[PDB]
Design a binder for this molecule. Structure first.
Ligand SMILES: Nc1ncnc2c1ncn2[C@H]1C[C@H](O)[C@@H](COP(=O)(O)O)O1
Length: 674
């Protein structure tokens, strides 16, 4: 058993009635002086090191050639200037195991933490040395953390693409299904998560072909996708689609392997009309989509279900099956208890505050349920015919660290620089053989700036997650993020002289987006929270009015700007609590070969133990209230894990989900039971 693991294990051995939290500091110190520092490669100087890495195909030559070597030296100097030390074994372990560049044989380490940051910053700044130094400071102070794909691969030659999220529409044909599978594997190889909308695919019995897929409906397509992934995959289906019960039964524990889907995540899209039909206890119907396309010349999930539902029911050329809508909502709650699946998207909560309904309404979401954008189906054809390209979704992500941003008083600076980094990654992306995704990147230019360390920050300032004080902080914080995000998007539009495709018809352009911001104040109501924002200018209704006019004049470069991802791996590197979620465990036990490892939550001690309250003991109604408060100021979505007990009944699970719906929650993610 290595010394660093032994020292890490001594945290759980009590001393004077307390956990030995400081033993983690010894553990990480041992990890460096007994392992990491013995496996790093020596170089005489920075010039030799960089020439070696370029010439041996580790780094790309072009992004470095934009700087003079003297300027590169100064950027690297900036990274090593602040004496960065990991506070825990796991934070250091997660960087050097998952992110640090290794030699090709993978026996030595070629990058310190400061080297990766220096290279990522030199990639972002595109020759601008002074901006590269700001990126280094932003990342070394841990104010901003680029997503895994960007942070891992930026500046490297042997790599995937830097984009995290891909969402694909799939039209109703074998050529389309075949192309969607091909594109999914291509994009998954590039390092991104891939989510597929299956709501336009024809239901069971509508496929009259002698192929293995035919007779199972969309489950056949789910199987092909699931097998291919053996980046991860997801599939979404509208609740009014006939195959909804078969779609759900892929995640049953008792389901046989010919129907079962193990790797692929699943999501269900629920409009209000289904919630209306659940409220009044009467039987409802699910539709065979190809019959709807035959009749109306439009896909089911493109048409307005509030208006057309009764018309689909009364039309005899539209085929249907009767269901009990309350019992399907019960089934959803039950599967989420057993499996964690499916994810739920409350479609009208997404679309009632969506800025770009004129392009399209939002029909589905991504692998982690936070990306929420317009899309349009493509039509892929054979050799001698022409493809008709629609609009898929791509979004590259990054996260603010709330703790460090507040302590450095740098909300404006970090949001605007992060937005610039996300914009450069979007500009330098080059997707081949997926023109609907290429269209998304070039024309829509969406980015996904999120945040982590909410609970960690609140807990270390004596603010409980469920308190009105916490919601007061979140309200003001994310308002500010949205303000400076929009401002920078509009500034970039002025500088570049470009806007996102069909900006002119958006709620940003009409002014409607800003209505609540020009009329209501979002500064902190509690004095304790107002003192935390001391030194930072909190935008007022008057600033918002001025921003509204600025946007009306110059437009906006980005179609979407903000979304809060789960941050599973990167949160360790940041010594941060995951996302805006409440923590699961005060101390995480995990396996390490034969031995165990222990990770106390970042900033956990005996004197703040109360404030690091475990998510399972919280009231999920009050957790809903927190995320709803954040969702006000996020144009896309928030990955909302729900934390449950086996004591809860199906009745209790339905009441939580229906309350989430009532408060305007856009999506809910994996359902976690203790
Ligand atoms: N916690 C932590 N994070 C990062 N790097 C670390 C850490 N502990 C030790 N080291 C590395 C940094 C130096 O190269 C050397 C001496 O660190 P010194 O601080 O002089 O003991 O070990």
């Amino acid at each position: 058993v290595p010394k660093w693991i032994q020292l890490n294990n001594e945290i759980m051995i009590q001393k004077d009635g307390k956990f030995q939290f400081d033993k983690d500091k010894e553990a990480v110190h041992s990890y460096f002086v007994d392992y990491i520092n013995q496996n790093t490669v020596f170089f005489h100087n920075l010039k030799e090191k960089l020439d070696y890495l370029v010439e041996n195909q580790y780094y790309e030559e072009e992004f470095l050639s934009l700087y003079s070597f003297e300027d590169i030296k100064e950027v690297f100097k900036t990274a090593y200037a602040k004496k960065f030390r990991f506070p825990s074994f796991m934070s250091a372990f997660k960087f050097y195991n998952d992110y640090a560049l290794k030699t090709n044989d993978k026996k030595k380490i070629l990058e310190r933490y400061e080297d990766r940051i220096s290279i990522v910053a030199l990639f972002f700044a595109n020759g601008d040395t002074e901006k590269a130094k700001e990126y280094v400071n932003l990342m070394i102070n841990q104010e901003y953390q680029p997503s895994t794909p960007t942070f891992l691969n930026a500046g490297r030659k042997r790599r995937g693409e830097l984009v995290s999220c891909f969402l694909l529409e799939v039209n109703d044909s074998l050529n389309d299904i075949s192309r969607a599978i091909d594109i999914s594997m291509q994009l998954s190889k590039l390092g991104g998560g891939v989510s597929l909308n299956l709501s336009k695919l024809r239901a069971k019995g509508e496929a009259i072909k002698d192929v293995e897929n035919a007779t199972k409906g969309v489950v056949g397509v789910m199987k092909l996708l699931d097998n291919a992934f053996r980046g991860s995959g997801a599939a979404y289906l509208n609740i009014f689609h006939r195959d909804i019960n078969d779609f759900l039964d892929t995640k049953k524990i008792s389901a046989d392997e010919d129907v079962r889907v193990k790797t692929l995540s699943i999501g269900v899209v629920i409009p209000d009309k289904f919630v209306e039909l659940a409220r009044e206890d009467k039987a409802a119907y699910v539709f065979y989509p190809h019959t709807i396309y035959k009749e109306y010349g439009q896909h089911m999930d493109e048409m307005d279900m509030n208006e057309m539902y009764d018309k689909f029911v009364d039309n005899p050329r539209v085929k249907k099956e009767k269901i009990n809508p309350r019992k399907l909502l019960e089934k959803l709650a039950m599967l989420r208890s057993e499996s964690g699946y499916p994810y739920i998207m409350f479609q009208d909560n997404v679309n009632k505050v969506h800025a770009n309904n004129h392009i399209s309404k939002v029909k589905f979401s991504n692998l982690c349920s936070e990306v929420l954008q317009a899309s349009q189906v493509s039509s892929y054809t054979d050799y001698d015919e022409e493809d008709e390209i629609g609009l898929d979704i791509s979004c590259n992500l990054g996260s603010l660290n709330i703790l460090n941003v507040m302590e450095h008083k740098s909300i404006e600076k970090t949001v605007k620089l992060a937005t610039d980094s996300l914009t450069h990654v979007s500009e330098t992306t080059d997707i081949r053989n997926a023109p609907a995704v290429r269209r998304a990147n070039k024309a829509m230019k969406s980015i996904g700036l999120g945040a982590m360390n909410l609970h960690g920050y609140l807990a270390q300032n004596g603010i409980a997650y469920e308190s009105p004080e916490a919601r007061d902080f979140a309200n003001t914080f994310f308002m500010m993020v949205n303000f400076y995000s929009i401002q920078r998007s509009a500034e970039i539009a002025k500088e570049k002289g470009e806007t996102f495709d069909q900006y002119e018809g958006s709620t940003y352009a009409t002014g409607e987006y800003f209505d609540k911001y020009v009329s209501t104040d979002f500064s902190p109501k509690y004095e304790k929270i107002a003192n935390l924002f001391e030194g930072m200018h909190i935008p007022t209704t008057e600033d918002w009015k001025k921003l509204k006019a600025f946007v009306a004049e110059h437009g906006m470069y980005h179609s979407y700007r903000l979304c809060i991802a789960p941050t599973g791996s990167i949160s360790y590197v940041q010594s941060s609590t995951a996302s805006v979620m409440p923590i699961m465990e005060r101390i995480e036990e995990r396996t390490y070969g034969n031995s165990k490892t222990y990770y106390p939550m970042p900033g956990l001690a005996s004197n703040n133990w109360f404030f690091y309250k475990e998510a399972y003991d919280m009231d999920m109604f009050k957790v809903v209230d927190m995320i709803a408060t954040i969702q006000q100021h996020i144009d896309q979505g928030i990955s909302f894990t729900l934390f449950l007990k086996d004591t809860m009944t199906t009745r209790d699970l339905n009441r939580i989900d229906l309350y989430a719906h009532h408060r305007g929650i856009k999506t809910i993610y994996y359902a976690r039971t203790k």
